[PDB]
């Protein structure tokens, strides 16, 4: 505990935290600039290095954090997150998921974690309804696969297509002009299937929204 106590005083420092939060904003701005073809032609090298750096520093940090916190660290969701997203950046999609390190600014900032925590908190109460929904979708996706998939493969060819189309219908997006009117040119009674779907899923959803009152 001679050396370990010297570490723990660093990790707990506000400097360290202020230093990490710093690099987050830096790297965060860096990634918005890596977005420009122009900028990368002129400064892309300076940048890809500056990235290699921060992920170094961040890896050090986690390892430091893990010494100081031992098994407490892996019981911590905010750290687990921090862990997971740095791990990702160690490893061509993975190239893109590296951006999720900017969420570190949520974990790393208590103002923010509060909100996220506050919203995540409400979720459990909502879940039993979420399974109602999903049971509802699955039954309808199934029925819609076999009612309309033969003549309308793009939208209902497969269970997953039906799931997607039904999601879209639930958002009400182009549901009549784009989906149900076309359908009725072949299945005049398609409205018997989709109007009640909309009544239900967009009456549960309003009700599912309301469970937002916890926050």
Residues 100-139 that bind a copy of itself (CB under 8 A): 100, 102-103, 105-106, 111-112, 114-116, 119, 128-129, 131-132, 135, 138-139
Stretch that binds a copy of itself, among 10-18, 55-63, 73-81, 207-215 (CB under 8 A): 207-215
Residues 18-57 that bind a copy of itself (CB under 8 A): 28, 31-32, 35-36
- Alpha-carbon radius of gyration of the chain: 25
The yes or no reply on residue 159 touching a copy of itself (CB under 8 A) is: yes
**The residue to which tokens 């710093």 are assigned:** 22
Distances (CA, A) of 64 to 44, 61, 149: 30, 5, 56
Does 174 show up as a binding residue in the annotation?
yes
CB of 194 to a copy of itself, least distance (A): 10
Residue 133: contacted member of ligand PX4, a copy of itself, none (CB under 5 to 8 Å, by partner type) = ligand PX4
Interaction site with ligand PX4 (CB under 6 A) = 28-29, 32-33, 35-39, 93, 131, 133-135, 137-138, 147, 158-161, 163-164, 167, 184, 187-193, 195-196
Does 79 show up as a binding residue in the annotation?
no
Calpha distance 56→50 (Å, rounded)? 10
**Backbone breaks in the chain after residues (C–N over 2.5 Å):** 91
Does 145 show up as a binding residue in the annotation?
no
- CB-nearer residue toward a copy of itself: 74 or 110: 110
Question: What is residue 84's three-state secondary structure?
Answer: helix
- CB-nearer residue toward a copy of itself: 24 or 61: 24
Does 159 show up as a binding residue in the annotation?
yes
Rounded to a whole number of angstroms, the distance between the first and last alpha carbons of the chain is 42
**The residue to which tokens 């890596």 are assigned:** 34
Output the known binding site for sn-glycerol 3-phosphate.
32, 36, 158-160
Output the known binding site.
32, 36, 158-160, 171, 174
């Amino acid at each position: 505990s001679h050396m370990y106590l010297r570490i723990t005083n660093i990790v707990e420092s506000s400097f360290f935290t202020k230093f990490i939060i710093y690099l987050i904003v830096l790297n965060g701005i860096t990634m918005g600039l890596e977005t420009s073809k122009t900028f990368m032609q002129s400064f892309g090298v300076y940048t890809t290095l500056f990235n290699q750096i921060v992920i170094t520093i961040f890896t050090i940090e986690i390892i430091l954090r893990i010494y100081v916190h031992r098994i407490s660290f892996f019981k911590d969701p905010w750290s687990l997150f921090d862990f997971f997203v740095v791990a990702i950046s160690l490893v061509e999609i993975l190239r893109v998921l590296r951006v999720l390190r900017l969420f570190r600014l949520v974990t790393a900032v208590p103002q923010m974690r509060k909100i996220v925590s506050a919203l995540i908190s409400v979720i459990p109460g909502m879940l039993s309804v979420i399974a109602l929904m999903t049971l509802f979708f699955y039954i309808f996706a199934i029925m819609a696969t076999q009612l309309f998939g033969e003549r309308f493969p793009e939208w209902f060819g497969t269970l997953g297509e039906s799931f997607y189309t039904l999601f879209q219908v639930m958002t009400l997006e182009s549901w009549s002009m784009g989906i149900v009117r076309p359908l009725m040119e072949v299945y005049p009674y398609a409205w018997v299937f989709f109007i009640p779907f909309i009544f239900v899923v967009t009456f549960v959803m309003i009700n599912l929204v309301v469970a937002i009152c916890v926050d």
